[PDB]
């Protein structure tokens, strides 16, 4: 098992998934005016994550570095897309497309969480195989409560 106490990437991924889960929990009752803050808090935890990953990359071999950068780029694309579904939903607050728009917000935010986990995995592999990891379900639990 992996020791997560000092592990800023793991902790930042957990915070990301928690912000996505807060978006989901607030969405149904939120007025359109309140959509910006909950997507921004997701993006803020992505900024922290990418920050802690960046700090790590120069210690990894070029192989791992490239593939980790692939995962980060995807996360950014995921946020860009959540921002797009957020705007659609705002513009449809007073139409009968509001519910569908919000469903598509949730899909986009869920996709982001899933890929945050996938970044965690590629980081762990890169550490493991570069003798950088430290040995000794919660992440998946958050994803499960979200999957509902």
């Amino acid at each position: 098992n992996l020791d997560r106490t000092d592990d800023l990437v793991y902790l930042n991924v957990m915070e990301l998934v928690r912000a996505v889960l807060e978006l989901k929990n607030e969405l149904s009752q939120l007025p359109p005016e309140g959509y910006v803050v909950v997507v921004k808090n997701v993006g803020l935890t992505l900024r922290k994550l990418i920050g802690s990953v960046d700090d790590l990359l120069p210690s990894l071999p070029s192989s791992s570095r490239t593939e980790i950068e692939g995962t980060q780029k995807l996360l950014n694309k995921d946020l860009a897309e959540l921002i797009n579904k957020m705007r659609l939903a705002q513009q449809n607050a007073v139409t009968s497309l509001s519910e569908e728009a919000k469903r598509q917000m949730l899909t986009a935010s869920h996709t982001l969480a899933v890929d945050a986990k996938n970044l965690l995995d590629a980081v762990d592999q890169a550490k493991v195989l570069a003798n950088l990891a430290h040995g000794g379900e919660e992440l998946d639990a958050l994803l499960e409560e979200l999957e509902r």
Partner: peptide, 19 residues
Amino acid sequence: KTSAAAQLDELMAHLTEMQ
């Protein structure tokens, strides 16, 4: 300030301008 951090700051700058 890699490409990912720069691309992300770009996305975040948009959200902040529409609150």
